[model samples]
Target: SGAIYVGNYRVVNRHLATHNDWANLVWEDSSRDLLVSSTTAQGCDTIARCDCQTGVYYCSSRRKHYPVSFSKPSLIFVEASEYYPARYQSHLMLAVGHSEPGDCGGILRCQHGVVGIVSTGGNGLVGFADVRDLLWLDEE
Candidate 1:
């Protein structure tokens, strides 16, 4: 179900855990629901992964999709979940709200340093493999 738009062509490249975290029964809530809704972190709304098209960007945080200029920088608050042992290369956990989960490869921001990219969810939290390093892919 991981689909992204690369121009007019659709792409499937949402890097998820290799062993299948969605099948994990260890973290599912008692209600048997791992996540309730979509990406609504603390009632915060931000951009998605496949958010760019031409010179503008699309936002799908709520039930709407609006366009924002891509030439400028925007701000969105993504609260960090408490530290835990890294899993499946995911070094950061986001408090994407008890009733929400981020899409795999979704973008997360905190007003500075573009933050992280979503991967999986567990215990009512979303996990992201830290891209703070290599997000540049160079400059080492």
Candidate 2:
């Protein structure tokens, strides 16, 4: 149990309210789909798709008819709230995928004010991997 621990943050509704900034990003329900961020923060600000847990995000306009696992560093972000019906475990995962030489894309598990670990999959193509609580590194 000597794993490195990082500071925690909350993914509150205030952070992800009805705003087009990150509201346009795609969020798939427990499915493998391509998620992209809107032009709010940055092309890669902080966006993701999550499970049936407690969270608020924009549903993608494009439907992911088939399943597709993201590459390494698939950007992902997570948030939870106890007061609400869902759990608010505000820990997140950030993954990346190298497309061309320097171009890349990924996922983010995020909250409002904190940025967690950053991971990456080579060749812009990664199969799949689970990031549990036991694998946290640093924070920003």
lDDT of each: 0.30, 0.24
Which portions of model 1 miss their true places by more than 4 Å?
A: 1-88, 96-102, 138-140
lDDT of 2 at 132: 31
Error of 1 at 137 (Å): 2.8
Candidate number with greatest TM-score = 1
In candidate 1, what are the lDDT values of residues 1-140, reduced to their tens digit?
23222122221212332233333212222111112111111322232333221121112234322222221112222343222233233233334322123344454444342333444454654444333332222111
User: What digit string (tens of lDDT, one per residue) describes model 2 on residues 1-140?
Assistant: 00111233112122222344245533312222122222322122332233312222211222112123222333343222221232222233222222221111122233431122222223332222223322221132
At residue 77, give the lDDT of candidate 1: 28
lDDT of 2 at 95: 25
Candidate with the greatest lDDT versus the true structure: 1
Give TM-scores for every candidate, taking all chains together and pairing residue i with residue i: 0.33, 0.19
RMSD to the hidden true structure, all candidates: 13.4, 17.1
Q: Which stretches of candidate 2 lie above 4 Å from their native place?
A: 1-17, 21-23, 28-36, 40-83, 86-140
